[PDB]
Design a protein around this ligand. Sequence first.
Ligand SMILES: Nc1ncnc2c1ncn2[C@@H]1O[C@H](COP(=O)(O)OP(=O)(O)NP(=O)(O)O)[C@@H](O)[C@H]1O
Ligand SMILES: Nc1ncnc2c1ncn2[C@@H]1O[C@H](COP(=O)(O)OP(=O)(O)NP(=O)(O)O)[C@@H](O)[C@H]1O
Ligand SMILES: [Mg+2]
Ligand SMILES: [Mg+2]
Ligand code: NA
Ligand code: NA
Lengths: 333, 333
Amino acid sequence: SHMPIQVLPPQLANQIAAGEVVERPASVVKELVENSLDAGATRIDIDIERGGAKLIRIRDNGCGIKKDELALALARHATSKIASLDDLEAIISLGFRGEALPSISSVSRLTLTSRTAEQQEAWQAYAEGRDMNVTVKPAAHPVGTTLEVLDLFYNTPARRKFLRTEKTEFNHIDEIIRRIALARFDVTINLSHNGKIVRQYRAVPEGGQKERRLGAICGTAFLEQALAIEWQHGDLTLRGWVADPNHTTPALAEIQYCYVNGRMMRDRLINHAIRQACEDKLGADQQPAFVLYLEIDPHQVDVNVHPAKHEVRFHQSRLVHDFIYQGVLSVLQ
Amino acid sequence: SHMPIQVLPPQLANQIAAGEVVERPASVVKELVENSLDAGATRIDIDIERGGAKLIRIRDNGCGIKKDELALALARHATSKIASLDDLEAIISLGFRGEALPSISSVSRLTLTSRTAEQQEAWQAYAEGRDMNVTVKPAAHPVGTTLEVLDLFYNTPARRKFLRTEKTEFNHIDEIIRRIALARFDVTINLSHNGKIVRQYRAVPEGGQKERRLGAICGTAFLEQALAIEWQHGDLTLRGWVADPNHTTPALAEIQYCYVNGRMMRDRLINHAIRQACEDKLGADQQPAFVLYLEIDPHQVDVNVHPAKHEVRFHQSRLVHDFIYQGVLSVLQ
Ligand SMILES: Nc1ncnc2c1ncn2[C@@H]1O[C@H](COP(=O)(O)OP(=O)(O)NP(=O)(O)O)[C@@H](O)[C@H]1O
Ligand SMILES: Nc1ncnc2c1ncn2[C@@H]1O[C@H](COP(=O)(O)OP(=O)(O)NP(=O)(O)O)[C@@H](O)[C@H]1O
Ligand SMILES: [Mg+2]
Ligand SMILES: [Mg+2]
Ligand code: NA
Ligand code: NA
């Protein structure tokens, strides 16, 4: 009661939000790359410097940002992905909070450069000050968007303390990129670190062979044990791969990539199902190696549980679990 | 790009926020009760109806809310607990986002009734509409604050679906109240369900005996095996109780309450430390029963990681772990 109930300053309120969604450089990358995916992007180039604590440049060939919408794009609670409660209960895109851009820009130097197909001129935008004021200016840029985030946490001393080493932090970026490359085989992704190309995942065309990118990501060992899954029931569909438990090593058990409607996710439920399927098949229980994709009606899953979409809750919980269990158990036989 | 980048409506933006912090009735209770604690409250009465899906009434004898600050209290990003980045990096209260009240009021009928010691008159306030407009009016109320949340999720059909049974949901409230009663022995707390008193934890006076409330909460079995801990090193202090691993049952292992600066918390780090201490002491590894309290300089711990403060990150990670490990290991010998 000594201090008055007061509205938080624009920038500080955003940093608090940034703390719950922007953990480290890998997190900045996840969000910006997911924006590119939503923008219809087909080629995404990521350039990192000093593990991303120095620079994070993400360029995409997505639809781009309108000039008169550059500022809105950097505003809080501003999004083009949903406009009602209905749209929310049926999320069909990675983003929907309209919080990512303003959050990251409040703890770094974020520059947004974009051009839509209907524009001859390209534009650049960024927020500054205690109030996060936006300024828009000319710039040369092809159709699409380039995000440039510099000096992550340069203005949040405390959080900068938690940054690991260049190598470690970049390693996390690499793993996140790896996860996204597996969610969208149809998307070409290039990753560079300190001027050198670390990796490049070329797109897998219509009905093309996925195994190729699969092996390039998870390794050849995994590809040899990988058992393709195709299990469906109405609006529940399980696809992807599961390696034979009898032939899974601790090294392979590192590959436990799971997706819900194309969104990377680590859900205790799904994981429990897949494992039970391997415990009841094989003799003992152990860590399985997999890359499963669960497609489901967006009304049966709630993704508004974590500010970073790290968790989900299935309405019909038991059903979903039994579904994945059978699916996996079906292939192990 | 078809839909324009647009700012979300007041109410919908809050519901999205509510989804990340207000899981179920127990969550509403946690937040409101934590507000009472911050308000200097010494007696907190909680009344629940139909597992809290019908009504959640929390009355406290805290300092209360100023009349001209009732609206601010219900606004977004509005708080009296912090006003700068400095205040944040050194959190000394349960709340600091200024998001709890508006979030819950956007998914229920929340009525705030309060009076400060300097006011003769009491007031009542609540938000309504797509824009969350506040209205303030007369009301009779002693010094303090009463929160009344009705029809949780009445306007969010999807989330209402996830509510368990009356008994289950109330069971979660009971467990949360149990956790808070353990964090503040000096606070009298009364809990009722459907007009009947379920529990009442009376305050433990200055230096009084805690064991009494300890046994009333965790049970007598735990109290018999409980080993008091008192381990300090500078600004790191570990207090509380740990039962002998050799005499811990699966029933007792249900008691694994941990606190950081008086804030209930379940951290994998701390848990790992306590267990390692029991694995290296006893023969095998297993679930330990405990009620530990970790006090530490607010600059060594970051609590701005989860919108509901469900997680933390220690700056000097290894040190903290070794500290709790020794502390526990010290008592087991
Ligand atoms: N690379 C991009 N290309 C085109 N439009 C973009 C790009 N990145 C962002 N946008 C637009 O900017 C708006 C949002 O930025 P952002 O702040 O990330 O929120 P969001 O995507 O709406 N939801 P969330 O991620 O949950 O915060 C989006 O709604 C898009 O319309
Ligand atoms: N029971 C109460 N008694 C007195 N003041 C209260 C009470 N509950 C809330 N308030 C005041 O209302 C303001 C905030 O409500 P709330 O929306 O819960 O945010 P917060 O406590 O600031 N932070 P957070 O919980 O992280 O959102 C507080 O900052 C207090 O000043
Ligand atoms: Mg986004
Ligand atoms: Mg609060
Ligand atoms: Na935005
Ligand atoms: Na508030």
